[PDB]
Symmetry: D2
Subunit: 328 residues, 4 copies
């Protein structure tokens, strides 16, 4: 009688759970950039989008849904209720408080996490959490605390963007693609990030071997300025357009690729360092991690210099002082 019945003959209507589902909590500039990066890389069969703002959330879901002809993602869902996030493999939290004062920004984000994290674990208890929101190093700890998930399943964006920006500026200087420009920025994400000058190489040849003054004050070519420009460019983007979207979105997708496909690639991501670099407190800092289907299965022990080790410990001390005064 109906055209659907006339045209299509159904064999079975059985309901089945998505095998490769990804949830994005926060539909901001970052959240949407992560979403489009994932859809275009064909990492998910189902994409769930969650936010507090109901109108923007429906609009963003619809805009992605209209472009479904050019995407290999059959299902794109949204809602205020986390029942839409059910059976998700990876959950990306980009949800954060608006920077206007009037509790502080760190205190506001913890409260936001106080209802996201229990709601996500409720529908997706075997997922891997990917924290993007700032302070990423503190919030990854807050996520780990509330979820009660093992250390490995709580991954933080960390210094993935710092290293991506550093490899670009290293790339521009040497006139080589950032993929061939190997450089690692570790520790606390942002201003307090530690560039590992010993690790800096192109084709296996160490840049500190050829140039011993690399990352020092007596560097005539002043290579210490490369890491200075990383921090400066981050403040420049906010001054020029108001937000960072594409660079972070693409980085999150690169982590999502390693997790969803069990690639076992090394990435600079925020993880628990309790037992390494003389750190005894429950603090999360970026170190090179082997990322797969189990989250952080392994972490690379990087030989740091006395000054690098003192910087990571200073961060570990300043971070724990904040974390110990956090109420749940």
């Amino acid at each position: 009688a109906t055209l659907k019945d006339q045209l299509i003959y159904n064999l079975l209507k059985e309901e089945q759970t998505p095998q490769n589902k990804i949830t994005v909590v926060g539909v901001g500039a970052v959240g949407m950039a992560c979403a489009i990066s994932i859809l275009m890389k064909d990492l998910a069969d189902e994409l769930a989008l969650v936010d507090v703002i109901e109108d923007k959330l429906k609009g963003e879901m619809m805009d992605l849904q209209h472009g479904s002809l050019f995407l290999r993602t059959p299902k794109i869902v949204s809602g205020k209720d986390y029942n839409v996030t059910a059976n998700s493999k990876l959950v990306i939290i980009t949800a954060g408080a608006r920077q206007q004062e009037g509790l502080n920004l760190v205190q506001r984000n913890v409260n936001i996490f106080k209802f996201i994290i229990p709601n996500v674990v409720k529908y997706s208890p075997n997922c891997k959490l990917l924290i993007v929101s700032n302070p990423v190093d503190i919030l990854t700890y807050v996520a780990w605390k509330i979820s009660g998930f093992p250390k490995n399943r709580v991954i933080g964006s960390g210094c993935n963007l710092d290293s991506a920006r550093f490899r670009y500026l290293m790339g521009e200087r040497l006139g080589v693609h950032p993929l061939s420009c190997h450089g690692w920025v570790l520790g606390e994400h942002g201003d307090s990030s530690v560039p590992v000058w010993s690790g800096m190489n192109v084709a296996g040849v160490s840049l500190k071997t050829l140039h011993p003054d690399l990352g020092t004050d007596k560097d005539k070519e002043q290579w210490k300025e490369v890491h200075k420009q990383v921090v400066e460019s981050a403040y420049e983007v906010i001054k020029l357009k108001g937000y960072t979207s594409w660079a972070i979105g693409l980085s999150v997708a690169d982590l999502a690729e390693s997790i969803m496909k069990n690639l076992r690639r090394v990435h600079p991501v925020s993880t628990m360092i309790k037992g390494l670099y003389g750190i005894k407190d429950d603090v999360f800092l970026s170190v090179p991690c082997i990322l797969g289907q189990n989250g952080i299965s392994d972490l690379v022990k990087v030989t740091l210099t006395s000054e690098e080790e003192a910087r990571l410990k200073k961060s570990a001390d300043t971070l724990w002082g904040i974390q110990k005064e956090l109420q749940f």
Copy 2:
């Protein structure tokens, strides 16, 4: 010797011309969505970005540049000067003005013509052998404005047209039949937007015509009301603006799909705004969406679609309305 000289031994420093360059004029919500869609599909070796707002332009260029580690595009450039657009294979114009509550349609068209009177001569100056891809609204009128100022042959002036209308229609057809929009073949033609004409005869799944099985398809006396599908296409477009304020992702992905066919010379059929003078009883220099074979030469060929008397009448009515504004335009 410097570290670069110590580490790398240069064989040649011969600065060559980019073989697959794409310029995006307008760094708005649409422009940026097109940019990221192109970069992720690896369609260009060089991407040029142009806008009037200098601050936003530098910020957007830098944000894409930082993500270069995850992209296969070595060069991303920007600037107010069009010298950055030199030797482009494709130029996407997303530059436009925002209509006000106390503003006439003809005024808006003129404002966008004044914007185009600055862009089009500047683009042809540095890229005379490029293909123009117009996104700005009214697309059908602005593709004609671009064609007149550039003096480019009709094939090299392509307009987005009903590419998004069709994409939205195939999605809603897809969700109703429970099949992927790629397997849901449907064509929306003519004037982009409200006046768009859905071709019900062309509407099929696996080659089987939906009008054949259901003759009341698209008719006012339909039991299932398949007219609601095209009605929802227009309604959803107004809904997105009401809910978030702009459309970005859907259009950006569609522009990249056109760009893929142009940049790779695929010769796939797409519903794009082209010179319609000669067919369906149209005598005026009007641009309307018809299925076009898109390649390296732009619109090399166009598909002759058998339209019904009502569909053909809807096409003339739009051609008459578009020409009405077109004759009242200042160059």
Copy 3:
């Protein structure tokens, strides 16, 4: 301590069960072409390869393993034992016997049935919730053999069928019209090979029916010889074997396109061999190609194609031709 212990600090050693695993039974020209097509499309996290010839199997596994730097597939396994196939989501059977001089159709199919009497119980033993994708010839008969031995529901037993016939047809239609095969919509149904039925009504470009514009389409009395398009499909298949000895790339790419729809739950329509008992006056348990909606549950739905009396009779003839062999099978 070891260098691995010195360099890397382990958090957990507990390995998870394969999530998106694909098994390829038969490491022949077809099997390897399927394997490389899947790996390059990044459809599997683990790829299992099975064959009777243990030497070639190890060599092929190693050759793919060496190229792992350029692939997004972390695990590539092989072995004579099917314990390597455990927890596979899709199993592609390309295992077959080679056609001999002075051999009966009943004789060749039974040699392949014996091969299947060993494979099918061994695959279900380790992967009971998988989807079987049959490639080996006669594909329409061996999909039925697979369905009977496995005891799997009709949806989980998919046969390659007329996916290659349609791909070849859309290419020849494409070359003639000077348009990309993706824009050239054509459906070849029924029994895969010589007895394949081209659906001339379904043949279109941009929704416009080629039978409508040209009523002589597919008839021997056509001056443009559009019936020669399907004749050239059969002729090219025999030509490839005459010129190189086997078909590999075309079939391999088609299998991956089916795999993409299954592994990603795309719900795209494909011409695949399925249990057609009940449709087009067919009463026997015969597998024939019809457009199917392919997803994570295998064949969830099938498209009811309006066939002409000549097309229906050809399909009915193939059903009788296949059942003649099927009822004579000892298994």
Copy 4:
């Protein structure tokens, strides 16, 4: 009129030349693996295939052509005449002779030099601005033969070299450390094959040097036996030929990775055979693998690798060895 005239209305009949053409000389196991790797990575708009064997060449061209529905490459051409190779951006030479039973190594070299005396002048005739990518063995000697006959600058004559050695090494390093070969940085330089030199100082994971926290790395005094990693690279290459008879997938994927950097001007570092004269105390016109920055101009730059006395002596021995054959060549 015709169905093509009825369906498609032509705007222009302009003949189009390929912008991104790739030619593959040799349609063997390697040649075909390169071809399918390139097509699936969407690196070319036109693919040209040439070989001496006319039958196999037509069969292989047709098999790829049939799979065009699943590929983004509109044109696939073949022929004995090199007029089909005209205006190529990259030419991959996989054409070779196989060592006969009574034949010596020196006899095999001259036979390939004779094969090259016919190919290289014919390729430069139609594609004088192309980049040659030689795969055929001995790669280090035949890249020199190609460079001498073509008269092309050293940057436009690229040899596969140790790209496969490094890919195999990074896989075995990867398996040992339980990390993806992409995160396992290791460089094998010099003469491709048995005489290849592994750079133990360069060996790292996340920037941390493996020679630093394991000083016995690559020496006989090693308890863990990391010397065997490179010895297994050689062993596995001989194993693949013993088990299946040829190497195809691993090399084809590596060739496509080089092609990606050339065709897209990525400027990525790769271990490829280049004119080493003037470096590491080498005075002869010898080609050896060193890390090269690969772009649209071929080898624009080299990476100066700090080699140990034994590594540097190993490289100058291979350069003296290769020249011993090269001076005795007749062309």
